[PDB]
C-alpha cells in the first residue's frame, strides 16, 4: 500500500518541458521528439520519506491554451503544484506569474507551489539567468530549482523536496 498520497500537477506553456520532466522521474529516460501532451496525461511513483511510503499521483497538463478547461478541472484536487518554465524561452518564464494567478483562482488556497526552470543543460541558449529565476521566487515566497530532464539535473530533488514540503504541512 501507501502511508500517504500526494495529487501533484505540473502546469506551464506549451514546449517547457513539462513531460519530459515526468518521463524522467517516472522512467529514468529522455526523448528528444516533441510529442505535445494533447488533453492531459499522469504518471504514478512511490517514494520514501522519513520511513513513510508517498505515492505521488502525478498530472502532466496539457499547456497548450486550447486545453485549458481540462487543466483548469485538475486544480481542485491537486496538492503540490510544480510551475515549470524554459530557461531559454523568456516568454515562458514571464508567463509564471500568470499560471501563479490560475493556480490562486481555482486551486486550493494552501497548495503547495515550486517553480522549476527546465533545459538547464542548454547554456548555450539561455535567455532566463538563475539570478532572475531565484528573485522571482523570492518575490512569491516559492521554492525554485533548475532543472534539465535530459541531463536528468534536480528533477529527483524537485519531486522529493515538494512532497516532503507537503508532509511537513500535513504533519503540522
Ligand atoms: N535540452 C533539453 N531539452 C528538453 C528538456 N526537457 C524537454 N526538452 C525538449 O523540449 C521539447 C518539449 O518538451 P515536452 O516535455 O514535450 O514539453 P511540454 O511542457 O510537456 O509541452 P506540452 O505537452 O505541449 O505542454 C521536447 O522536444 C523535449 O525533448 C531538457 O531538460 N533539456
Ligand atoms: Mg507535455
Redesign the pocket.
Known sequence: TYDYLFKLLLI?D????????LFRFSEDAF???????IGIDFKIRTIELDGKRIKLQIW?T???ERFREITTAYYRGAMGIML?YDITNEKSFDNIRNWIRNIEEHASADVEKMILG??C??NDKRQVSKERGEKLALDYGIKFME?????NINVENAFFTLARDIKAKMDK
Open positions: 506551464g506549451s514546449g517547457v518541458g513539462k513531460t519530459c520532466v526523448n528528444s521528439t516533441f510529442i505535445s501532451t502532466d496539457a499547456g497548450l515549470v527546465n533545459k543543460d542548454v532543472t534539465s530532464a535530459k541531463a
